[model samples]
Structure formats: C-alpha cells, structure tokens
Target: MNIFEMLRIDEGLRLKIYKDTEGYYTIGIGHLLTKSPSLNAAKSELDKAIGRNTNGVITKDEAEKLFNQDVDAAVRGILRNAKLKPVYDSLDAVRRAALINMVFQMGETGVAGFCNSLCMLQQKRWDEAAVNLAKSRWYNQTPNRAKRVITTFRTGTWDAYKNL
Candidate 1:
C-alpha cells in the first residue's frame, strides 16, 4: 500500500500513451517503454502485455496489473543491487517502501550514489540520514515529496505521507 499509494500520488495515472519530460514514450504508472530498444518494439510489447494497441486506451484494471509488475520489478531491482541490498535488509517495511519510492524517482544507480546516507540508514542514524537527504539535488528537485520521504525515513512511519 505504501509504495502503490505513494506512486499513485507521485506518478499520477495515465490510461494512454504519452511522452515523459525527456520525450520518451510512457504509459500506465510511469512505465517507460523506452526500456525497449525501439519504438515499434515498445509498441509491440505494449500491445501484447496490455492486450490493446499502444495508441488505444487501457482500463484501470489493466493499468493496475501493469503497475503491479512494475512495482515488483523495482523491488527485485533493489534487492539485486549489491549496494542497495544491505540497506533494504536494514529497514522496516515503511522505510523500505520509502527507499523503493526513492528508487522509483531517481533509479537504483542514482539512489546508490548517496553512499553516506545509505550507510547512516543501515546504522539507524535517522536524523543524520534526513539531513543527508536534504543535502541532495533530489531534495531540491521535488522538495515537497522529498521532505515527506525524508520524514518517513526518519520517523519510520507513514504519518508524513498521509496527505500525499
């Protein structure tokens, strides 16, 4: 619920194909079809996956299924990453969901760059970790969401994410 609901807030919903800020084709809950090698390949896979043409609209149920796969993949990606595994293992579900959301926003490699903050989290130095998060461009880029995530990470609760 934490990861899914936060994503519903953060990514919003789109039933049809659209271009992201970087002009890459995307659909559903922030699914990047650019992960496919070519545009036609993306469309082909999209059609097979969602059982509709890429240009056609998808049902909410279809989108939910698609989102589930994406979320699961994100988790697997986090678990598979050497740098992220220990941090993932260290946190409670709430904090882990926040970390997953962080990965969703900035990607595993991007999140992994915060080696100090990651270590602090593993060590349970939450206050220091929050401060470390505030020092990032990720914080500056979307301070509202980042603040909520930082608070969630620090407090190990969903209270900060209640509104969002």
Candidate 2:
C-alpha cells in the first residue's frame, strides 16, 4: 500500500484541506500550510509534497521524509510538562508513530481534548474510551477520518478503511 493508503489520504479530502486557490496546498490533517524550510510565503505546501501537474502527489518512498517533520518537539513538550516518561515505550513502532502523527496534526491542545477518553482507556474501559473518542472534538470535527482511526485502534482491523 502507498503512504496515502496508509495515512488515508483521499482526493476530495485533499481538496478540502488544500482548498481551491492559487498555490494552495494541504500539509497536515487540519489543512496546515507547508512552508518551505526557509519559511517563506511560497506556494502551497501541497505543491512541495506532491508536485506540479502530474508529479505533485507524494509517493510511498517519500513517506519518511514527509511525515512528522514537526512532532518530535511536541511530543517532548508533552513528556516534559506532564513529568512523564515517554509514552512510546508501550506501543509498537507503528502505533507509536501513529500517535505522534495524530498528535502533531492535531496539536497539543487538540490532542488534550482527548484526555477524558485517554483516562478511560487507562482504566481499561475500552468501550467507554471508544465512545469518548467518538464524542471528542476531533471526532466531531473530522468524523470520517477519526472513526476509521478509532476503529483501527480498537480492533486493529484495516478492512473498514477501504473507503477512506
């Protein structure tokens, strides 16, 4: 599967994130702008990720370079402020990466919106956590993407992701 496949990128969703504008591009789940490393007001970040015309779509090979360019500091910040050891020790590599991925795209505040759900999860209340997850701002804001990922986290099944 491609990186878009793994990350569940779609053309319509991409358009929503990037919008219909000159040089607009979607960089994150929230339609964040991708700036040039130089931080100039260049063309949309999508253009940088994908390309111009036919060559603009990011490829699976570029996944490593393209993903999580801003998450490390955020994760460290969380750890530091919470006075907690890294949460990554318990999760598998992919799950850890996905947490970072979600956290980065959602930002620390948005990620904190899931706190009640996480607390339930810590109590082994998996079903309640799922419901809380669904009730979160993240879920209400982007139900399509959030549902798929919540299901994946709950069941470890990617079958339901076919439509994304």
Candidate 3:
C-alpha cells in the first residue's frame, strides 16, 4: 500500500478553505496556509498550482500536487532527523507509516520528543510504543488520527485503524 495514501486518508480532503481544529487556515490536504513561513508565498503557490486567480476552492488533483509535496517534506524531515533517522530506518513499512503520519501532523521535531515511544519502536516493542503515544497530549488533541496511528503501531497491520 502507498504510505502517501495512508497519510492522505488520515488527514482526509477539504477542497475549500477551512479552519483546522487548531484554527489555522487550511486547504487541500491539510496544508496549513496561515502558519506557513510565508503565508503570501504559500497562498500564491497554491494559486499557481491550481492555475486560477481565485481562492476558496481547489480541485482534487491540484490538491494532490500540494499534498504530494507536503508528504515529501514530512518524509524528508523524518529521514533527516537525528533522533528519528535510525529508529525510522529500523521499522517495517507499517510502523514507519505511523511515524510519518505523526511527523506530518506535528513535524519531525515534535515526534522526536517521544523518547520512550521511539525507543520502544526501535526495540520492536509494539504495544509499549503504542502506550507511550497514548499517554501523550497528541493523542488527546486528535483522537481520531491518534487512535489509528496508535493502533497501527500496536498491531503492525496496514489496515489497523478505528472508524473515521
């Protein structure tokens, strides 16, 4: 299965401008436009990708383009993180996807804070890793995504998840 699809499904798609749970202006596949390093630049990039002068809407394929880049960044960030690099490299694809999903939502540095969880993952202690994650604030913040990610880690199953 495509790891990217795993992320996309977890995030879901919003074709119109909307506020995320944290009140950031987001669009497409969870692109945080308001929080971008340069909001104008990011908005313009979104405009250019969709090839229109207007805002408030986007097509799925155009959104996919942006999502692809976002996913690439998450992957690259995870690979380059010193704390995450070896642990990420040590996991199987299913577990790796769970890590990437967390990174995509919270950034690589954020995931790096889960020292115990990462250690458990590195040692292939699936349930312990899940427990470490379950005790975190990230779990409570997004119960839906967190449940799926935690379950994926616990079971090492590609389809491990709760209902969306």
lDDT of each: 0.84, 0.49, 0.80
Clashes of each: 0, 2, 0
Residue pairs whose backbone atoms clash in candidate 1 = none
Tens digit of per-residue lDDT, candidate 3, span 47-154: 766678645678888789889988889889888889999998998888888888888888888898998889988998887788888888898889878988888888
TM match of model 2 to true structure: 0.56
Model with the higher lDDT, candidate 2 or 3: 3
- Candidate 2 local lDDT, 110-141, one digit each (tens): 66666676565445465676687887666776
What candidate 2 gets wrong by more than 4 Å, as runs, is: 1-5, 8-17, 20-31, 34-64, 68-88, 92-98, 162-164
Task: Provide the TM-score for each candidate, comma-separated.
Answer: 0.84, 0.56, 0.86
Which is superior by lDDT, 1 or 3?
Answer: 1
Measured on C-alpha atoms, candidate 3 has an lDDT of 0.80
Evaluated with lDDT, which candidate comes out highest? 1
Candidate 3, 44: how far from true, in Å? 5.0
Ranking by lDDT: 1, 3, 2
